């Protein structure tokens, strides 16, 4: 009910370089009255509970199906790649009032299901960008799961 997001993951082991390309979102929830949504994507690199790095896409105006093709790279040393989370949040930009979250997902070793599958496919295919769709989840539910270590 919140929408779907597609992004690719690439890890370059010898470089300790993690690249997330936000490709496209679709079926996004409508978050404006007298408009659609104005989605941008924020990416947080976290280590369980702690914020490490953040990046964000441009804003696409008045659409529930944004296309980005924007690449985001993070330094994650080989020894640390199974300790981090890449958190992807889609938000509706508003000039007036809160920028409300449409939904979010995270990938990493402590993710589950299709999110863990994507992460494992990345690690299993070093230097190759692996693209996968993800269902967006309620922000507060994903936030709770960020604390669950494996």
């Amino acid at each position: 009910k919140l929408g779907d997001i597609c992004f690719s993951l690439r890890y370059v082991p010898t470089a300790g370089k993690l690249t997330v390309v936000i490709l496209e979102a679709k079926n996004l929830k409508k978050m404006d009255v007298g408009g659609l949504s104005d989605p941008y994507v924020k990416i947080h690199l976290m280590q369980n509970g702690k914020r490490l790095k953040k990046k964000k896409t441009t804003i696409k105006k008045n659409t529930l199906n944004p296309y980005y093709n924007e690449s985001f790279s993070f330094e994650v040393p080989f020894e640390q790649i199974q300790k981090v989370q890449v958190v992807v949040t889609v938000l509706d930009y508003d000039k007036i009032g809160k920028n409300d979250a449409i939904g979010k997902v995270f990938v990493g070793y402590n993710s589950t299901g299709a999110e863990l599958r994507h992460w494992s496919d990345m690690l299993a295919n070093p230097r190759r960008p692996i693209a996968q769709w993800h269902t967006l989840q309620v922000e507060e539910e994903v936030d709770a799961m960020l604390a669950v270590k494996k």
């Binding site: 690249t19 953040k54 990046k55 964000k56 896409t57 924007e70 690449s71």
Partner: peptide, 10 residues
């Protein structure tokens, strides 16, 4: 607080 970086440029 840090200004949020945008997409890769290279």
């Amino acid at each position: 607080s840090d200004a949020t970086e945008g997409h890769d440029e290279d």
